[PDB]
């Protein structure tokens, strides 16, 4: 038993990370296969950030400036080009270490590991959630940009998120590894409004599935509701609203518990309108919405990678 | 910026991660060198764990009867012991993949890393606090017996912590790599007291500075305090006296911020004896005591690992 934010072991994305260096400016990249990603604004100086003309910026550059080092290692630089938000650096040797690997576009709402990384090596691994309004609450100091977010599956990796930024409110931005930013954001240093951000209705509803599992059942009511009930509720709070391919995602849980879903969104409506009594759910004073149900499933099962 | 709970790069510890089978049952062990290390209930059916002579059930055994297995690919046993709660099994193949190691038997308070593994393969990472009372709050299912936890100094590895067992009260309880339990603790299926626990005040005072430094900065308040007087407070919420030697260990978070100690005492007094107020510290509505000071520094100032 017990309930924990879990990441995927970084084994297999460790072996990726390399460091990249042009002229002043060094960030992290990915190297798979004989390609290394990196954040286009490796090629940014300070003040280049505050309005950069990336295809100006880029002409002036060639193979040679680009300096890429894979833990002692230099690798030769064969080739650049821009794809979105990205640089894509060919290089002359293909990276041993490279895993199975797919690149996907997360939905918001879903979960990944992030390894952060500086100068090339790994410093640690947790877990985050993609927000609502494409935003995610990392770890992730000067020099991080191009750490990478992850799924495993068995022995796939599905790399969703690379870093670039920090919004001045805190909190981080970046692209998929096609160079595309999750939500409005572009890379350059201006004031850049996120959306009003909601709570991630179905991962609360898994989280309170993954508490009465481990025991704790306080919660739990005499009260049921309606899907269009629960979802006046949610608006008034700032929730996202329940849908049915939510509840179908729901079901197995449902149907390990033997509370109906409708139920659970019941005790989830009395938890939003009485607050929780200085009463605690799993360790927690608040509503928790970072755990997926995909992700509860696998807590309470014993999911394994090679 | 962000703040994170975050554990460290798994890789060097997935390498070693093996399975090992005695006669019917089956948990993780921990490939070093030429040597695997494992829970010694390795070989003890279900009723033999109600009351186990571990030296006799260990004389029916011999080298044949471990079946350990790395991936795919098997090792030969050549000698087993016992050492305290551990089982030494001495294969004759070394495993090129022993990283740097040193096996270190922690403090109540410190924290770790845990590889949470089934049947051989690591299924996620996360960080962990060696409580007060020697028990550790994870997430171990039905086979996650022998799982690690383990810190690394840039290179070197750790190791501190072999899982054990669940109490019937859902904590987990554990060894050092020398088969030495953490806390009063026996690897038998009986009901065992944990002792009182309390809440690490070195590790609060630490994650104050670390919100501080992120700019979650409420609390700090008009008032300051003695040394007694907090302990005087401390002692009736159940958390640990304070001593000079956490004082110290405080100093450089202490001088980063420009808030000395005793004043950071007496906004966690005030939060004590008032609470949150609805507020979020570090978006946590309680207390966080799973820090220590230097994993505060070491997420300040961006401590990598090669
Ligand atoms: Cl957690």
Redesign the interface.
Known sequence: ????????????V??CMVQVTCGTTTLNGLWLDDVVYCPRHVICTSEDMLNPNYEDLLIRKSNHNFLVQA?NVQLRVIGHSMQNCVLKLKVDTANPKTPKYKFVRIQPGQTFSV?????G??????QCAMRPNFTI????????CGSVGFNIDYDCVSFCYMHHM?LPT?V?AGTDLEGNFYGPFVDRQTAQAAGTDTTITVNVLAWLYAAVI??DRWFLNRFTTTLNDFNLVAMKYNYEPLTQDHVDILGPLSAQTGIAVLDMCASLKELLQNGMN?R?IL????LEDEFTPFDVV?????????
Do not use: D, I, W
Not at 1 to 12: D, L, N
């Open positions: 038993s017990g309930f924990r934010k879990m990441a995927f072991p970084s084994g297999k460790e072996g833990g390894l952060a990384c500086y100068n090596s790994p410093s640690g691994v947790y609450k990392g770890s992730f100091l000067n020099g991080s920090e805190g981080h481990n025991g200085g605690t360790g927690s004073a608040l696998r807590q309470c099962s014993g999911v394994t990678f090679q």
